[PDB]
Subunit: 317 residues, 2 copies
């Protein structure tokens, strides 16, 4: 049925224009949902045609919004899954159900990724600690909230400056008696001297471990490498991607400059070329320890996960 | 009078045998009392002859115990006092221009210096409250009575954890931590094999020091180099709570026997046995903290970066007295 085209186009449109959803994992699951819908309801002879088709829709879905790359690496992982199924059926008839059950098992693993990471938490934290976290990510909120039922500590969250989501995260955390304190972002280094380990979220984790976080993190990662306190990058294994740092500044996402300098100012808005990015690169040499849905990792080792998750060839997509 | 002779000789004997008296400020006060005795019981009428006299005892002393910089730089400072008063009265040659007036002035200046030297713990203690903001974890090391006075003064209006390593050659951190907890500071003894594991969780590193050189670099009770090197790897701010007389104007590698090796019995007691034949045991007591790890000397005049310490030489010791 041609309702598949409607799913595709509505997905694309709600990808470009508005932010939906908020939990990135929900975008992951609905990317996989649309992908299953694609990978049944369309005609193909061999798996080659299916790979070509998936790469076509993936190119469109990524050039749609190249900063929100969750969906891009989801398309890449589904391409890896079809490659695996073709290998198992080759060393043209029934691989469809195999691919579908593999995608289903992938969705199964994706449901409980926050619970995996939560279960992992209680080890890395210790009592009477002082953690800092930037912005608001659901993974970190779980990680802190559920592992604060056994051990009491503090968390110095920093209100991110363009969109003070740190406020929402701080209220969510302090609705669990966790002692969250909200500092304006500017004063990160003012207290990055009394912080025992920093736990940041992410939006991606490039091939070499260089994450890409809510703006105001490269400052946090530098102010950590200064005092040599370790960044704990709580980040599920679908927030990875085989892209490498070079992205011709489509890397960042450049939101409407109405956030920093409001349109209600005056004439000074004709000369001033206001900037407001939201995503900051973080080099792999300040990160200490990733927390994937399989376990802890050292930043370097991240590259290996790539060769075991996304096929090396389909990185151009 | 030969009484001065026997006193000086007993003094240098005590210096060679074993520290006397123990407290560094007490040794500086004793050195000054002796030096004053020289300026009341010897034959001099010039200033040059007195400078030669003072150098003739100071060489003996600073060659007795090369790690007693207290008495050495105290002799240097009395020399500076001589230079200053003789130059202001008469005035580069020193001549016997005048007489006892100079000696009365010298005794008065030495009395003032000694009074400033006896009330320095209280100065730094009153300077504490501004530094120890509540809920710190102040990591000391060893037992330096100035740092104990500093901390048990600052903890009369705030509250903060206090890690204290103990010096492993021979443990004195224990007595400091016991004296601390008898004032209720919530202190934490530990052997200094763990200065790097329990440093990430430290806010400010408050160390004493035996002697501040003229790089800012100091010579402090052992294992404090590695504490400073860790607390600079973790970029916490050091605080060298040293009064102003623990300040020799030598320079780091301009001194041999920098350290002070003590009887290796403490590191590997004699009870050990045969294996004491083929092992060279070293018990360095003092270690050389370079000047770029330190941050803030807390002297009786206030706080000072290390890059101000050199100026203190130019304002305390004459440039031709850095060889005593």
């Amino acid at each position: 049925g041609s309702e598949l085209s409607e799913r595709i186009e509505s997905f694309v449109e709600t990808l470009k224009r508005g932010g939906g959803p908020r939990s990135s994992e929900e975008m992951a699951r609905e990317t996989l949902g649309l992908l299953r819908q694609i990978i049944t309801d369309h005609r193909w002879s061999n798996a080659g045609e299916l790979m070509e088709l998936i790469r076509r829709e993936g190119r469109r879905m990524t050039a749609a919004q190249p900063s929100e790359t969750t969906v891009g690496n989801m398309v890449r992982r589904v391409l890896k899954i079809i490659r695996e199924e073709y290998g198992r059926l080759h060393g043209y008839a029934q691989l469809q159900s195999n691919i579908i059950e593999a995608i289903n098992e992938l969705l199964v693993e994706l449901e409980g990724t926050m619970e995996n990471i939560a279960a992992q938490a209680l080890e890395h934290i210790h009592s009477n600690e002082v953690i800092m976290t930037i912005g608001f990510s659901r993974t970190v909120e779980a990680f802190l909230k559920e592992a604060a039922r056994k051990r009491k500590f503090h968390v110095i969250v920093a209100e991110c400056a363009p969109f003070c989501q740190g406020h929402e995260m701080a209220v969510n955390l302090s609705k669990a008696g966790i002692e969250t304190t909200v500092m304006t972002d500017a004063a990160i280094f003012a207290v990055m001297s009394r912080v025992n380990k920093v736990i940041i979220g992410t939006k991606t984790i490039l091939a070499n471990g260089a994450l890409r976080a809510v703006t105001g993190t490269h400052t946090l990662a530098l102010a950590a490498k200064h005092h040599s306190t370790p960044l704990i990058v709580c980040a599920p294994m679908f927030k990875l991607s085989p892209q490498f740092p070079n992205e011709e500044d489509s890397f960042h996402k450049f939101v409407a400059p109405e956030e920093v300098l409001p349109f209600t100012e005056g004439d000074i808005l004709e000369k001033v070329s206001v900037h407001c990015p939201v995503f900051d690169y973080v080099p792999p040499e300040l990160i200490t320890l990733f927390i994937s849905n399989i376990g802890g990792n050292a930043p370097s080792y991240i590259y290996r996960l790539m060769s075991e998750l996304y096929h090396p060839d389909d990185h151009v997509l």
